Amino acid sequence: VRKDPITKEWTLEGGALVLADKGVCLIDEFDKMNDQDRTSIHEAMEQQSISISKAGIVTTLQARCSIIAAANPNGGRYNSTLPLAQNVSLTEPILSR
């Protein structure tokens, strides 16, 4: 929930997830994402809803989105014979989703 441009009352806004509900959410370069976002995506996949507690506004918005992602392997084209989870940075539990 963010203060508006110029001078205006505070409007609520969803992330890509809320905005795209029933539709298709398209994200790329997970590896470059700040954890603050990572938790949001994780939550969205987990319970199919984003909860917002700030400021006074308190809800659960519903994002049912299909996530399609583009990710970049750590370093080279094929980083190792080692398994995919080892091949890329993204932790195994987020990947299991």
Task: List contacts with another protein (CB under 8 A).
Answer: 1, 4, 9-14, 18-19, 21, 53, 55-59, 61-63, 93
In whole angstroms, how close is the CB of 82 to another protein at the nearest point? 15
Cα distances (angstroms) measured from residue 86 to each of 51, 64, 77, 80, 82: 32, 29, 14, 8, 6
In whole angstroms, how close is the CB of 92 to another protein at the nearest point? 9
In whole angstroms, how close is the CB of 35 to another protein at the nearest point? 10
| Rounded distance between C-alpha atoms, residue 97 and residue 45, angstroms | 7
Strand partners, 70: 28
Q: Which is nearer to another protein, 51 or 74 (CB)?
A: 51
Q: Which is nearer to another protein, 44 or 63 (CB)?
A: 63
Q: Which is nearer to another protein, 21 or 43 (CB)?
A: 21
Q: Show the CA angle centred on residue 84, arms to residues 83 and 88, nearest 5°.
A: 120
